[PDB]
Structures are given as C-alpha cells and as structure tokens.
Design an enzyme around this catalytic site. Structure first.
Site, PDB file in Angstrom:
ATOM      1  N   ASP A 135      64.202  32.315  32.198  1.00 34.99           N
ATOM      2  CA  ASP A 135      64.009  30.834  32.604  1.00 34.99           C
ATOM      3  C   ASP A 135      63.925  30.151  31.854  1.00 34.99           C
ATOM      4  O   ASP A 135      63.747  28.485  31.808  1.00 34.99           O
ATOM      5  CB  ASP A 135      63.777  30.808  33.854  1.00 34.99           C
ATOM      6  CG  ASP A 135      62.521  31.064  34.155  1.00 34.99           C
ATOM      7  OD1 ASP A 135      62.039  31.103  33.300  1.00 34.99           O
ATOM      8  OD2 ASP A 135      62.291  31.561  35.985  1.00 34.99           O
ATOM      9  N   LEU A 157      77.041   9.247  30.381  1.00 33.03           N
ATOM     10  CA  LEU A 157      78.077   8.867  29.365  1.00 33.03           C
ATOM     11  C   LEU A 157      78.490   7.552  28.575  1.00 33.03           C
ATOM     12  O   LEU A 157      77.556   6.670  29.821  1.00 33.03           O
ATOM     13  CB  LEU A 157      79.371   9.115  30.604  1.00 33.03           C
ATOM     14  CG  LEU A 157      79.191  10.259  31.396  1.00 33.03           C
ATOM     15  CD1 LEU A 157      80.543  11.023  32.239  1.00 33.03           C
ATOM     16  CD2 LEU A 157      79.623  11.425  30.148  1.00 33.03           C
ATOM     17  N   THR A 167      61.891  27.287  37.355  1.00 33.14           N
ATOM     18  CA  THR A 167      62.285  28.614  38.103  1.00 33.14           C
ATOM     19  C   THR A 167      63.767  28.483  38.695  1.00 33.14           C
ATOM     20  O   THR A 167      64.436  28.742  37.908  1.00 33.14           O
ATOM     21  CB  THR A 167      61.368  29.401  39.608  1.00 33.14           C
ATOM     22  OG1 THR A 167      60.197  28.888  38.736  1.00 33.14           O
ATOM     23  CG2 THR A 167      61.728  30.304  38.924  1.00 33.14           C
ATOM     24  N   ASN A 170      73.982   3.156  33.904  1.00 26.50           N
ATOM     25  CA  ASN A 170      74.482   3.375  35.183  1.00 26.50           C
ATOM     26  C   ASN A 170      73.648   5.519  34.735  1.00 26.50           C
ATOM     27  O   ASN A 170      73.628   5.524  35.627  1.00 26.50           O
ATOM     28  CB  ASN A 170      75.731   3.990  35.804  1.00 26.50           C
ATOM     29  CG  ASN A 170      76.949   4.620  34.908  1.00 26.50           C
ATOM     30  OD1 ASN A 170      76.414   4.877  34.098  1.00 26.50           O
ATOM     31  ND2 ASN A 170      77.573   5.255  35.649  1.00 26.50           N
TER      32      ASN A 170
HETATM   33  C1  LIG Z   1      69.862  35.497  36.837  1.00 30.98           C
HETATM   34  C2  LIG Z   1      69.717  35.627  37.437  1.00 30.98           C
HETATM   35  C3  LIG Z   1      70.398  34.048  38.278  1.00 30.98           C
HETATM   36  C4  LIG Z   1      70.158  33.118  39.544  1.00 30.98           C
HETATM   37  C5  LIG Z   1      70.626  31.785  40.115  1.00 30.98           C
HETATM   38  C6  LIG Z   1      69.734  34.151  40.489  1.00 30.98           C
HETATM   39  C7  LIG Z   1      68.505  35.516  40.261  1.00 30.98           C
HETATM   40  N1  LIG Z   1      67.879  36.151  41.153  1.00 30.98           N
HETATM   41  C8  LIG Z   1      66.745  35.690  41.786  1.00 30.98           C
HETATM   42  N2  LIG Z   1      66.554  37.155  42.312  1.00 30.98           N
HETATM   43  C9  LIG Z   1      65.623  37.065  43.259  1.00 30.98           C
HETATM   44  C10 LIG Z   1      64.476  35.054  42.794  1.00 30.98           C
HETATM   45  C11 LIG Z   1      65.180  34.671  42.240  1.00 30.98           C
HETATM   46  N3  LIG Z   1      66.653  34.429  41.752  1.00 30.98           N
HETATM   47  C12 LIG Z   1      64.711  33.164  42.277  1.00 30.98           C
HETATM   48  N4  LIG Z   1      64.112  33.418  43.888  1.00 30.98           N
HETATM   49  C13 LIG Z   1      62.418  32.366  43.153  1.00 30.98           C
HETATM   50  C14 LIG Z   1      61.852  33.065  44.899  1.00 30.98           C
HETATM   51  C15 LIG Z   1      61.021  31.678  45.287  1.00 30.98           C
HETATM   52  N5  LIG Z   1      60.272  30.946  44.279  1.00 30.98           N
HETATM   53  C16 LIG Z   1      59.228  30.554  44.279  1.00 30.98           C
HETATM   54  O1  LIG Z   1      58.392  31.848  45.106  1.00 30.98           O
HETATM   55  C17 LIG Z   1      58.371  30.546  42.569  1.00 30.98           C
HETATM   56  C18 LIG Z   1      57.958  29.479  42.469  1.00 30.98           C
HETATM   57  C19 LIG Z   1      57.677  29.053  41.519  1.00 30.98           C
HETATM   58  N6  LIG Z   1      56.249  27.613  41.025  1.00 30.98           N
HETATM   59  N7  LIG Z   1      56.168  28.196  39.874  1.00 30.98           N
HETATM   60  N8  LIG Z   1      56.576  29.276  39.850  1.00 30.98           N
HETATM   61  C20 LIG Z   1      57.075  30.048  40.423  1.00 30.98           C
HETATM   62  C21 LIG Z   1      58.051  30.638  40.603  1.00 30.98           C
HETATM   63  C22 LIG Z   1      58.883  31.320  41.580  1.00 30.98           C
HETATM   64  F1  LIG Z   1      59.349  32.796  41.701  1.00 30.98           F
HETATM   65  C23 LIG Z   1      61.695  30.324  43.662  1.00 30.98           C
HETATM   66  C24 LIG Z   1      61.282  29.621  42.167  1.00 30.98           C
HETATM   67  C25 LIG Z   1      62.764  31.170  42.909  1.00 30.98           C
HETATM   68  C26 LIG Z   1      63.695  34.816  43.579  1.00 30.98           C
HETATM   69  C27 LIG Z   1      68.925  35.957  38.814  1.00 30.98           C
HETATM   70  C1  LIG Z   2      77.775  17.749  32.634  1.00 29.54           C
HETATM   71  O1  LIG Z   2      78.457  18.249  33.174  1.00 29.54           O
HETATM   72  C2  LIG Z   2      79.151  17.499  33.935  1.00 29.54           C
HETATM   73  C3  LIG Z   2      80.651  18.715  34.324  1.00 29.54           C
HETATM   74  O2  LIG Z   2      82.098  18.587  34.126  1.00 29.54           O
HETATM   75  C4  LIG Z   2      80.154  16.203  34.076  1.00 29.54           C
HETATM   76  O3  LIG Z   2      79.882  15.310  36.022  1.00 29.54           O
HETATM   77  C5  LIG Z   2      78.857  15.079  33.524  1.00 29.54           C
HETATM   78  O4  LIG Z   2      79.506  14.497  32.988  1.00 29.54           O
HETATM   79  C6  LIG Z   2      78.123  15.906  31.812  1.00 29.54           C
HETATM   80  N1  LIG Z   2      76.704  15.240  31.442  1.00 29.54           N
HETATM   81  C7  LIG Z   2      76.804  14.888  30.409  1.00 29.54           C
HETATM   82  C8  LIG Z   2      75.530  14.302  29.925  1.00 29.54           C
HETATM   83  O5  LIG Z   2      77.749  15.296  29.838  1.00 29.54           O
HETATM   84 CA   LIG Z   3      77.162   5.819  31.230  1.00 27.13          CA
HETATM   85 ZN   LIG Z   4      58.307  30.079  37.567  1.00 27.91          ZN
HETATM   86 ZN   LIG Z   5      55.691  30.035  37.689  1.00 31.61          ZN
END
Ligand SMILES: Cc1cc(C)cc(Nc2ncc3c(n2)CN([C@@H]2CCN(C(=O)c4cc5nn[nH]c5cc4F)[C@@H](C)C2)C3)c1
Ligand SMILES: *[C@@H]1O[C@H](CO)[C@@H](O)[C@H](O)[C@H]1NC(C)=O
Ligand SMILES: [Ca+2]
Ligand SMILES: [Zn+2]
Ligand SMILES: [Zn+2]
Ligand SMILES: CC(C)CCC[C@@H](C)[C@H]1CC[C@H]2[C@@H]3[C@H](O)C=C4C[C@@H](O)CC[C@]4(C)[C@H]3CC[C@]12C
Ligand code: NA
Ligand code: NA
Length: 791
Positions: free
Chosen positions: A303, A677, A154, A673
């Site tokens: 996701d 890259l 997630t 490493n």
């Molecule tokens: C577009 C976008 C991007 C981002 C970075 C943010 C959001 N908004 C958002 N709003 C609320 C939540 C989240 N994103 C993600 N949150 C989860 C709550 C806690 N949680 C879980 O218990 C969880 C665990 C699991 N294990 N397997 N499947 C799972 C599903 C779950 F929900 C986290 C993983 C994240 C609430 C929206």
């Molecule tokens: C992913 O992007 C970040 C930021 O430009 C960079 O540090 C990293 O080297 C990139 N990874 C690959 C595998 O291209």
């Molecule tokens: Ca390298």
């Molecule tokens: Zn999930």
């Molecule tokens: Zn899940």
C-alpha cells in the site's frame, strides 16, 4: 447458533444471528464456539514426519492424515514432508505459457497478496531473507517500485488498489476523516468504519459480483492468524465450481508494525520480512499441493513505504499560531486544519496560512489551501479534505502542541513521489509475462489490470486502460485513440491594421512576403513532431503557423490551448530588445472581436502578461516579432512572470542542451473548481479587469526528446523521453521561501514540486497528445502516465 462446519464460510448471515466469517471478530458478532472451532492452533501450521498418515484429530489447526486432500485441510507442507515432494521455491522457474487449471475453472483465479508498509527497497535484501518473494519477482513480471496515492496512508491506498480511484473520488481521503454533510468522524474503533456511507467508487469484489464472478472476502480480522488466512483461501479454492471464488485477497499488518517501532533501516526489519516470505512460501506450497501453482495469477503488492520519523522531529503549530485551541488538526506526516467551534470568530483561514508561511529558516512543513497543492497529488475535490493542508517534509511530524526515547521510529503519509513512500509490485502466473521487468507505475493503474486478469469490465476509474498492457502475456482490452471533437480552422492574413482597436502598441513600421512567413511550409515538420494535439471538446480554435512555433489559438478563451516549438541543442538565447519591451502586435489572421486587448491589462492593476512561445528563443531578429503577437500572449501575475521568464530564458535552453534538443508544448489550464478536469466557460471565476479574457489557474509545459539522446529530438527513431509540469499561476511566490534570492536558487525547486503526467494535463485541458508517432498506442499510453519525480 454454532460454527460447526461453518468456519470462514462465504455466506452472509444478517443480524442478529452469530457469524463464523472473516469479519465476525471485527464486528464482534461471532458464535460462542468460533474461538475454539475456527481459531484452532493445536500442533501449529506445519506437518512433521511423525504426523504423516495420522488419525484425523479435529482439534488440530491443519491435518497430515490420508483424508486431508479430499477434506482439503492439509497443512501447506503435507505433500513435501509426507509424499517426498519439493517446496515450490526449490523448483526452477518454468514459463507458464497457458493456465493449467482443473476442468470447471472458467477463468484463472487472482490472489492479491497485500503487505502493509512494504518499502520497495526491502526487495534488495534478496533471496537470503525472502527466497519465495524473490522467486515470484524473478520468474514473473515486476516493477522496481509502484507509486502509492497521497496521502501515503493505509486505507486510502488499499481502497485505491481496489477501486483504481484517487482518494478524492473514492472518499477515503485519510485513516481519519470528518464529513460535514454527515457531521460525523471516520475512526477505526467500533462499527463506524463498517457504515457503507464512507465508501465510494466500485471495489474489485463488487465489480466481480455484479458481472457474475464470485469474490472471497478481501478483509481479515487481525485475530485470524496469517497461517489460517492462507489455509482458508486454499480451502475456498477446493470448493465446487458453483461456490468457488475467482478473486481472493490476503492482507498482512507486516512489515508496517515493525517499521513504525524500529524504523525501516533497523536490523529488526529482517525478521518480519522472513515471516512474510514464510507466509508466501505456505501459499505457493499450498497452490502446488492443489496443482494450482500454474493456474492462479498472484499479485504481491504493498500500500505504501516507510520513512525514518522520530518524535524529536516534530513541528508545533503553537510556535506559529497565537490560538491553537481555536483549530482542529489531523496531525503527523500530513496536516489538515479546520475551525474547532462555530461560535469562535477568531479563526480565519487567510490569517492562519500567513502565520504558517516561511516563519522559521528550517521550517519542515509548508501550508497550502488545498486548491494550490501540486495537481499530481489530486487531493482537493472532496468535502472531507480540509481547505488548509500542511505538506510535511519527509522524516518529520507536525503536531498542535509540544505536549502531544520515542515509542516510534518509522512513519508514512508523506508526498507520494518521496522514495521512502514507494512500495512493491510483482505479478506471477499464466496471464503475467515471464522473467520481465517493467517501468515503475501508479497504483491507480492496477484496478484495470486485475479486471483484465478476471475478464471483467472495469467501473470508470483514474487508471489509463491499456497503459499496463506490457505487464500481460495476453490482453482482452485493446486501447482506441479518442476521436477529435473540434476540427481546427487555418485562417489566412485577411484583416487590415485599421480594423484593430486593442489599445496595443509596438515598434514595427510586401503583403505576400508576410503571408509566406505564416504559411504551413516546414513549420509542422519542425515544431509539431508528434502531430497536432486533438481537441476532445466542442470549441472554435485556429492553427497559427510561424517560423519558430505553431499554436492552437482558442477564439473562446482568446489565447492558445497549446503552443508547440522545437529548441535544438545548439539553439542561441537572445534578449527581449529594449525597443520591443512592451510590444504587442495585432494578429491580422484573427478578428479584433476574438483577440485580447492591451487596455484590459492596463486597467487590471494586479495583472500583467507573458508569451507562450518565448521571444528569448527567436531564430532571428525578424522571427522574434512573431513572439509579440497578441495571439501568443497570456495573463500572468508579475510574481509568476519571475518563474515563467526564468523557465523560458534559462531552463528551456538548459533542457535542450542536456537532452539533445527538446519539443515544448505550453498552454493555459483553467480548474477553478479543482476537480482536475478542464473548466467550461461557466466554471471560470476570474477575468482580466473589465474584459472576458479568462485568467488561467495554471500553466503547463510538456518537454519531449528522444530516449536515445544520441539522436536529436526532431530525428528520433524509437522511444520518447517526457518531463511535464503544471505550475500554479499565483499572484505571490509565498510557496517559495527562498524567492528573495536569485531565480537560480528556487524557480527549478518550485517546478520539480509541480511535475505532472501528460495524462494530468490532458484531463485539465481536454487535449490528446502524441497522435502521430512511430510508437504503438499502448506504448504512448505508458509515456502519458510517466511522472519525472526528481528523486
Ligand atoms: C487487497 C486488499 C484491499 C482492501 C481494501 C482490504 C484488504 N484487506 C484488509 N484486511 C484487513 C485489514 C485491512 N485490509 C486494512 N486494515 C487496517 C486495520 C485498522 N487500521 C489501522 O489500525 C492502521 C492504522 C495505521 N496508521 N498508520 N499505519 C497504520 C496501519 C494500520 F493497520 C487501518 C489503517 C486499516 C486491516 C486487502
Ligand atoms: C477519476 O475518475 C472518476 C470516475 O471516472 C472521475 O469522476 C474523476 O473525474 C477522475 N479524476 C480525474 C482527475 O481524472
Ligand atoms: Ca475543473
Ligand atoms: Zn500503514
Ligand atoms: Zn503504518
Ligand atoms: C479489520 C477491519 C479493518 C475490517 C473493516 C472492514 C470494512 C471496512 C468493510 C466490511 C464490508 C465492506 C463494504 C462491503 O463489502 C460492500 C461495499 C459495497 C461497495 O460498492 C462499496 C464499499 C462497501 C460499502 C464496503 C466498504 C468496506 C467495508 C465496510
Ligand atoms: Na497591469
Ligand atoms: Na517567497
């Protein structure tokens, strides 16, 4: 100290003052009356005919009063129930040629509608179950699926969405993490996950803010009903110009929740999908109410997917390891192992890997040191990723002990090329194309597109900017091909055989006759179909011409950076003649001082050699001698020569026969490493014994043909078809549990697991491919981001 006319404010109230925002519940820092004022549920979320022109009752969740439009807190279906207007979904697709926004809107807003655990194949349930989502899909731009990142969990995928970075770069490598620098664990209970120290890269809301574009809060406390999230977004859109955000996010915990309980194929999955569609219906009815339905760009995106996983299908480490009390395991759909205590001397990574390697016939996980994981996963370059990793078979769990009807029938986290882990993408609005289908793409690409939609300069990320230009009606970013940094040399036959003391022998024995067989001729036309690869780093290399292949030979690494050759459908496979078995020939175009020596290979007891152009595909007996040139040889473990010999002798002919000819570009990769890259000279940690001949960590091949297979590879008019690999250069085949059997039983299995994008190789080699084609550069960028999944 109250939430009066403050509910879900965009204002940031610092501690200890009580908050009324999206996240106050999650922090547990809301005002006492938040739950009564901001979590109103009275009369539900839908207007009925009886409520139309009602007296405003502030206890109501939403309003059907005449003043509700000016207040901007009408129920999403007010205009439909009270003003006799149609639901958005009941309207026909009408092309959005230009954004139709109110004056004062300086850009079309973006709404990211994110759905947790939404499997791509859920879309097949159709308009019966999801009429609103199906209209977005059909009227807008959609991919059959979108590839998540590994692990297919997630937080790693949500944050990838927001940053365009691999988890190894943005720092959220799992839902669970240990950081040795912090000496702390990342967990979901309490305040820990709110500490900024965990979160790297630059998310879209910060990119926007830093360039003077207001973002609404992406995160939503679970306490807030979905209906309230939609109304709050719509409320924010009604704000004045100086306050109104341009970018918004909605999040649903569905269909993830039900997926875990019932599995992805349960008939119980229909109800969650109906409710998600209802929520989508409320947004679009809400936008239409505000006349923003032809103004706002909407992204519907998941996701990750969901697989069938029952507690019955669990591998236990206690069946492999004699002491599971000496290790910590991150368990489930992936395994991460580290030592439990420091005093403990019994823990030893090599012994643990050995103990977990091909011990049971049906073994449903494989242990890897993280640097030996398929490079396409890009899951190694972070101190939060444990050295020891278990890749778990789809539908399976790995746990430490047996003691750890099932409660769960669905899970995710598996290899990101697994079909069941694929998720959804739909773009709808003025900036997205009308009724358009696009090929599947990786979620790392979306950040650049969302930046383009908002007129923002993307922070540096792992997207290929331009590769998704074909999603958009209008593009404010035109990609430019990178300038070649190193010009090639074209060395003639100049050195005498007496000048060479490489300790190499061959069964060989007309000067200008030798030369004409190694001139430009038609070699480039036949063997370099897409132009010379550009070297994007400072180095000294030579273009070497032959009848059967062309190579860019590095005078620094003493081997080719790339070897290019075309195998026709009708090409014949020959053997290595017995008299040429151990043949290595000096290349009289290249100085003895910038050549490998066969003495090195004899003294190195563990290291043998192979060839980049295969002797097996020589055009004639005569031409085959060119394949044994010291400038065509590379360091190979005997174990790896089994894989490489089979690829060259059997699979290249096979691919040529299936694809109406193939262009092959093969060469070494150095990534000691494991940062994905190209290594500098300093970063290379292994050489052939008593020499400065560097040992590659990997060998790549790029296999190109005509997408129109009715045209041969060398006479293609239109789009190209590519499959690529990055094979780990291992001194054993422990990764292949069936390697005891004939190569026909395992080698191609190994190669499919290490499938790669052309971009993956470009990063690892500092080369730029496909510079001379009939294709637009944005088309070529899409080609370079393609992955052949074999799913
Ligand atoms: C577009 C976008 C991007 C981002 C970075 C943010 C959001 N908004 C958002 N709003 C609320 C939540 C989240 N994103 C993600 N949150 C989860 C709550 C806690 N949680 C879980 O218990 C969880 C665990 C699991 N294990 N397997 N499947 C799972 C599903 C779950 F929900 C986290 C993983 C994240 C609430 C929206
Ligand atoms: C992913 O992007 C970040 C930021 O430009 C960079 O540090 C990293 O080297 C990139 N990874 C690959 C595998 O291209
Ligand atoms: Ca390298
Ligand atoms: Zn999930
Ligand atoms: Zn899940
Ligand atoms: C319901 C729960 C899942 C809510 C959890 C939300 C939590 C992970 C969020 C809240 C605030 C977020 C940070 C904040 O927006 C600012 C930044 C700056 C940016 O440059 C890097 C990311 C970071 C630290 C955000 C990370 C996610 C946070 C902590
Ligand atoms: Na040897
Ligand atoms: Na083996």
């Amino acid at each position: 100290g109250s939430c009066k006319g403050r509910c879900f404010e965009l204002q940031e109230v610092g501690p200890p003052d009580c908050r009324c925002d999206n996240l106050c519940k999650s922090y547990s820092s809301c005002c006492h009356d938040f739950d009564e004022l901001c979590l109103k549920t009275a009369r539900g979320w839908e207007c009925t005919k009886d409520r139309c022109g009602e007296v405003r009752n502030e206890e109501n969740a939403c309003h059907c009063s005449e003043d509700c439009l000016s207040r901007g807190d009408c129920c999403t279906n007010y205009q439909v129930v009270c003003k006799g207007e149609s639901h958005w979904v009941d309207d026909d697709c009408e092309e959005i040629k230009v954004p139709e926004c109110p004056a004062g809107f300086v850009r079309p807003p973006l709404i990211i509608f994110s759905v947790d655990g939404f499997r791509a194949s859920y879309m097949k349930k159709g308009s019966k179950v999801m009429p609103n989502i199906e209209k977005l899909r059909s009227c807008g731009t959609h991919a059959p699926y979108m590839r998540p990142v590994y692990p297919t969990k997630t937080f790693p995928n949500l944050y990838t969405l927001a940053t365009g970075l691999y988890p190894e770069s943005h720092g959220i490598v799992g839902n669970s993490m240990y950081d040795p620098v912090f000496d702390a664990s990342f967990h979901l209970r309490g305040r820990e996950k709110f500490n900024h120290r965990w979160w790297g890269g630059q998310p879209l809301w910060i990119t926007a803010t830093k360039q003077g574009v207001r973002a609404g809060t992406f995160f939503w406390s679970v306490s807030i009903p979905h209906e309230r999230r939609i109304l709050t977004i719509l409320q924010w859109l009604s704000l004045p110009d100086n306050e109104r955000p341009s970018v918004y996010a909605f999040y649903s915990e569905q269909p993830d929740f039900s997926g875990h309980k019932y599995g992805p194929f349960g008939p119980e999955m229909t109800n969650p999908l109906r409710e998600i569609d209802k929520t989508v219906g409320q947004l679009m009815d809400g936008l239409k109410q505000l006349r923003l339905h032809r103004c706002v760009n909407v992204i519907f995106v998941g996701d990750h997917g969901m697989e069938d996983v029952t507690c019955d299908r669990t591998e236990f480490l206690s069946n492999y390891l004699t002491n599971v009390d000496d290790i910590t395991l991150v368990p489930g759909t992936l395994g991460r192992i580290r030592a439990k205590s420091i005093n403990n001397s019994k823990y030893d990574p090599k012994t643990i890997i050995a103990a977990l390697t091909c011990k049971k016939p049906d073994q449903h996980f494989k242990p890897y040191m993280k640097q030996h994981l398929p490079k396409r996963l890009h899951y190694a370059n972070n101190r939060r990723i444990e050295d020891i990793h278990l890749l778990v078979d789809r539908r399976w769990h790995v746990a430490r002990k047996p003691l750890d009807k099932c409660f769960f029938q669905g899970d995710h986290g598996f290899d990101n090329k697994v079909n069941s882990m694929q998720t959804v993408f739909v773009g709808y609005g003025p900036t997205f194309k009308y009724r358009t289908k696009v090929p599947p793409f990786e979620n790392i690409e979306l950040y650049n597109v969302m930046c383009d939609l908002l007129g923002l300069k993307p922070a540096p990320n792992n997207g290929t900017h331009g590769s998704l230009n074909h999603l958009l009606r209008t593009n404010t970013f035109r990609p430019t091909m990178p300038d070649e940094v190193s010009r090639p040399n074209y060395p003639g036959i100049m050195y005498l055989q007496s000048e060479f003391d490489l300790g190499c022998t061959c069964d060989d024995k007309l000067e200008e006759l030798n030369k004409r067989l190694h001139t430009k001729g038609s070699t480039k036309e036949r063997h370099l179909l897409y132009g010379r690869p550009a070297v994007l780093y400072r180095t000294s290399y030579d273009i070497l011409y032959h009848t059967d292949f062309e190579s860019g030979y590095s005078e620094i690494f003493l081997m080719p950076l790339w070897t290019s050759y075309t195998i026709s459908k009708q090409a014949e496979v020959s053997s290595i003649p017995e008299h040429l078995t151990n043949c290595v020939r000096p290349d009289v175009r290249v100085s003895p001082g910038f050549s490998q020596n066969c003495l090195a290979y004899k003294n190195d007891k563990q290291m043998s050699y192979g060839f980049l152009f295969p002797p097996y595909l020589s055009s004639s007996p005569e031409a085959k001698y060119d394949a044994f040139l010291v400038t065509n040889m590379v360091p190979m473990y005997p174990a790896f020569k089994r894989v490489w010999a089979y690829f060259q002798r059997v699979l290249v002919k096979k691919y040529a026969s299936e694809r109406n000819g193939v262009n092959v570009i093969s060469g070494p990769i150095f990534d000691y490493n494991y940062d994905g890259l190209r290594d500098t000279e300093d970063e290379i940690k292994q050489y052939v014994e008593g020499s400065s001949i560097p040992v590659p960590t990997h060998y790549y091949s790029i296999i190109t043909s005509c997408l129109d297979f009715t045209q041969p590879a060398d006479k293609c008019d239109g789009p190209l078809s590519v499959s690529s690999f990055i094979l780990p250069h291992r001194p054993d085949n422990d990764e292949s549990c069936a390697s005891s059997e004939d190569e026909s039983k395992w080698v191609e299995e190994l190669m499919k697991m290490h499938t790669a994008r052309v971009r993956d190789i470009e990063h690892l080699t500092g080369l730029d491919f496909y510079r001379k084609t009939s294709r637009s550069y944005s088309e070529i960028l899409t080609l370079k981001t393609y992955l052949h999944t074999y799913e």
